[PDB]
Amino acid sequence: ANFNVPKLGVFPVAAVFDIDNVPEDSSATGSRWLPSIYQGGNYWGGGPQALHAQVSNFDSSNRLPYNPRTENNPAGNCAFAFNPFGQYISNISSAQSVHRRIYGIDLNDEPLFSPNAASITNGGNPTMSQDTGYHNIGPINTAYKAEIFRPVNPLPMSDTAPDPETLEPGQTEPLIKSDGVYSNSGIASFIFDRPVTEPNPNWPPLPPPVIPIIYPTPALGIGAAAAYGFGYQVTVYRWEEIPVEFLNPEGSPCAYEAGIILVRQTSNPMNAVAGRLVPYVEDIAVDIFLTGKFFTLNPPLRITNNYFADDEVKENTVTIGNYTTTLSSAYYAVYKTDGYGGATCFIASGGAGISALVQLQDNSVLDVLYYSLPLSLGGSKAAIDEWVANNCGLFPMSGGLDKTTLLEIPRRQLEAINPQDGPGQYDLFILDDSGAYASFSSFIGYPEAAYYVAGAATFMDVENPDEIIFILRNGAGWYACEIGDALKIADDEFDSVDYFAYRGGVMFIGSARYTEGGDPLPIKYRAIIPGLP
Amino acid sequence: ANFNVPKLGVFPVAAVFDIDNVPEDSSATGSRWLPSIYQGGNYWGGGPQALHAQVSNFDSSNRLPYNPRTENNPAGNCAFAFNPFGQYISNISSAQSVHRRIYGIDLNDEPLFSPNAASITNGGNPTMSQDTGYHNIGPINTAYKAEIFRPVNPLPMSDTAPDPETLEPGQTEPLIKSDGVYSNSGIASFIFDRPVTEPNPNWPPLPPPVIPIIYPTPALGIGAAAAYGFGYQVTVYRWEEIPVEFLNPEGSPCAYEAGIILVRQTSNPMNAVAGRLVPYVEDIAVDIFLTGKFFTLNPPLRITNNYFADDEVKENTVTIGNYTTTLSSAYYAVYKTDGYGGATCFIASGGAGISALVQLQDNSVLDVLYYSLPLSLGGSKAAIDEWVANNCGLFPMSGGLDKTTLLEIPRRQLEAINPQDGPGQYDLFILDDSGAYASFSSFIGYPEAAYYVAGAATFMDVENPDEIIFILRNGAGWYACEIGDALKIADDEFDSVDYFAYRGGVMFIGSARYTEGGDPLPIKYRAIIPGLP
Numbered sequence A, B: 001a002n003f004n005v006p007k008l009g010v011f012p013v014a015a016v017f018d019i020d021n022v023p024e025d026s027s028a029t030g031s032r033w034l035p036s037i038y039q040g041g042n043y044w045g046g047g048p049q050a051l052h053a054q055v056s057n058f059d060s061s062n063r064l065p066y067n068p069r070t071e072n073n074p075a076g077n078c079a080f081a082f083n084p085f086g087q088y089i090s091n092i093s094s095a096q097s098v099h100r101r102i103y104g105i106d107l108n109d110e111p112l113f114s115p116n117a118a119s120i121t122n123g124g125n126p127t128m129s130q131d132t133g134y135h136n137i138g139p140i141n142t143a144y145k146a147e148i149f150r151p152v153n154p155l156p157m158s159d160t161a162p163d164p165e166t167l168e169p170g171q172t173e174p175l176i177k178s179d180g181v182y183s184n185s186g187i188a189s190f191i192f193d194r195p196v197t198e199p200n201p202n203w204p205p206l207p208p209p210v211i212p213i214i215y216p217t218p219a220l221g222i223g224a225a226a227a228y229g230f231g232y233q234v235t236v237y238r239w240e241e242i243p244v245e246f247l248n249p250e251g252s253p254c255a256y257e258a259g260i261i262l263v264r265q266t267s268n269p270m271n272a273v274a275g276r277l278v279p280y281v282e283d284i285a286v287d288i289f290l291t292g293k294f295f296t297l298n299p300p301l302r303i304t305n306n307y308f309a310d311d312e313v314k315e316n317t318v319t320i321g322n323y324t325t326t327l328s329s330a331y332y333a334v335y336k337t338d339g340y341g342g343a344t345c346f347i348a349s350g351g352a353g354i355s356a357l358v359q360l361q362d363n364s365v366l367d368v369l370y371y372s373l374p375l376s377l378g379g380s381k382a383a384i385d386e387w388v389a390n391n392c393g394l395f396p397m398s399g400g401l402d403k404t405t406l407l408e409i410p411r412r413q414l415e416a417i418n419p420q421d422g423p424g425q426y427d428l429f430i431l432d433d434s435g436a437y438a439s440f441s442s443f444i445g446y447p448e449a450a451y452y453v454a455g456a457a458t459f460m461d462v463e464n465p466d467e468i469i470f471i472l473r474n475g476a477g478w479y480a481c482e483i484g485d486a487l488k489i490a491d492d493e494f495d496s497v498d499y500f501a502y503r504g505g506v507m508f509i510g511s512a513r514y515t516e517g518g519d520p521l522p523i524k525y526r527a528i529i530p531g532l533p
């Protein structure tokens, strides 16, 4: 719905200052601290402060361990979702390993875990990687480690023929039944901010409710999981029968039977026993608790954060990760600034994938929380802006003022109080009596106090100097500030407003300069104070 | 030996310039691009250029893999020595493992390597670390990995009783003799820039001379080694005897003997064979080729490199490693500068240990080669200066001019052509007619062309303004440049020379300023051109 905004007047210039005590910026390069009138789409601005993000070259060594920030792990730095899972697949090979390991035949034996490929790919949001350097089963490298092998029921042992000199049946490990029934373990999903737990048998009323089994190490991207019921079958043998017989006169020994086993004490042949080793098929089941190490690639970032304060220009720079050489500028980047070195930024090196929500103060990184831009956004600036607004509460409020037949701006940017789209958020505020300005003028606005001060209302005729726009955030009305005097150079020539910012009731202007030949010169900086109510 | 240097005259000031177009530096802080007259000990200066090195906080995750730079591995970044070694110790446990692995009983079996602790400590120059995350033998983590197990002689197999239905003796693995002779392997020293090789049997005249066995991965700090002759003993059994016998009339079978084994074909009891399984003790020897992963802690570094050029002041900053927050300034640091952003630096975060030789150009790290300061230097500035000169060809030539009864300087700094100590390198050059200057004046000199221009000859009397010293590098003579006019402020007051640099026949001066109360003000910068011959 449209809403008319009447021009209530013109704010006269109360003071002008040449800003000379500052570093030289080439008009062909741009201001190092003053955002250009074409950068409204990169800011939710609050003052003469400018940021730029560079992406360092990287490789598979620039890793971000999966360390999710949650209620239970507030010190983690990941905000994106990742839910890996898999199973221990049972077959002659893996059963062999589990078997030899639980019976103590060989403690280096361990079955190989089978991750679900798609849960690792994670819909490419972001694409995760398994750290195969984490653990190895012999010559095989794996990102998984069996921590605990727990048989569900006490392990069976096979009986053996009674001892000749003791008649006491011995013992030996059951033999795996190669053609028996194999059972894959259940679903093992890794968790990172809390241990794997099982319900306390006698929970009510004895605490604790659950019992911790194993712990993940989120700082290292190590997750924990439980693979219940890995099963295979074995052949167990049990002793049997009795004894007795009657062998006499010139001897004392008898004979008969088939398939049976007769043993007679070596110290006393009269003391005897018999029986058989009956083979039974048994189910071996074991719960296996494991850990998994994951990560995603994270290109190092370098951010400059410069602003004007105390009449000077403070330059800052920060790096995140092992920065080496620059690969390019960040694909996407929006900055909310306070005008004094404070800034919340959302930086995405690419059009999708790993992104960083950064909190800055001068050259200090107060915090970094990582997000991931879904591939579905198709690298669309407009699409990402909405996604960031929804997931981080950030939106480029400084971009929005536009001049078609008249100046107009959406409620959202004008009010600059709610980053998310919503009812009435796209209502259009049209400024009346603003038709003379040209269509090609660009605006970067600063929502402060009662006004949305947008810089850069230009004219098709050189004779008319640029004007700054002050719009009441309640839509009640707007004012213009003619800064012709402040911008006047030659008798008939004027400096244009190419860089603009507004803070504490003060306007900061940057003007591009060139030689008669067209060679870049230092940007002219000025400070203009409007006579506000 | 002393050498007299006569004062040949006074170089008049040909021009003076107020350097105003530069950033504000607090007199309580120091110049950001102009070295102070007290920093001669940190430079082999070449112009108005200043550097500072900060050490980031770090932990065991900030690693420097051992990647030595040598003729065969020119892309490595380590220059310090490290020679780890160890052996595979033979005993029932390790023999068991090697045995089960070479005979294919269990392929996850691997003996544990025994490093020589002191070779790892490396005399703390620097202290090296083993990467136990590199490989594991079951639940045990280790920095070593057996790559190849090579038996010296073909593995023996034990015979077994002939097959009842075939009469053909079978086979089975020999049994380890628990109380047999165990032999530790030979010395295994890891190498990083070339493979482990063995001489080519038929070398002359058939190439190649040596044969590559395994390769190290220096970029990952992975070294390679050969552990020859790991030995243990086994009990091997061999078949024996013959057959024949004569059992008749109502039968066809005989009996006798003791400890012997008689087998009669199941399909033909008449076809028979006999013998015994004779046990012999055999020596099993195996060469084992392995890799080892090492590294040393490397605190990230951040370096500012600022200088004046094209009448402006260029500020640069570089980081090496994953810099986070600052822990402190580098303990030791010397910089050789060209005056235009180019610099070779030797930075040591601590008083001993890992150090970096860095090549810079503005904000670009051209190269980094790591060295190690021996603990024996006792963190002594003077001791390290000599060590760096000897191992890197770097010495703080800008520090050396001193005024006792007269100005004097050692040949080494004066000539500024050879960083190493040596004959005549400490000959003292004493400037005649320089006795009026005060003892507490400080000097930072710049060896350029024919002169060693040292800034800061001060007087005990405020009435006399500071003077700049020009000494002929051949010791032929010296000149002074009275810059009283250029430094004059009040009628009876003068600015002092607190920061100084000299380049292209131009003198750069920095002067500390304060309020009548004693509050710091911006440093006053000037450019003075002396009327040279």
Ligand SMILES: [Ca+2]
Binding pocket: A402, A403, A404, A438, A439, A440, A441
């Ligand atoms: Ca337009």
Ligand SMILES: [Ca+2]
Binding pocket: B402, B403, B404, B438, B439, B440, B441
């Ligand atoms: Ca002195």
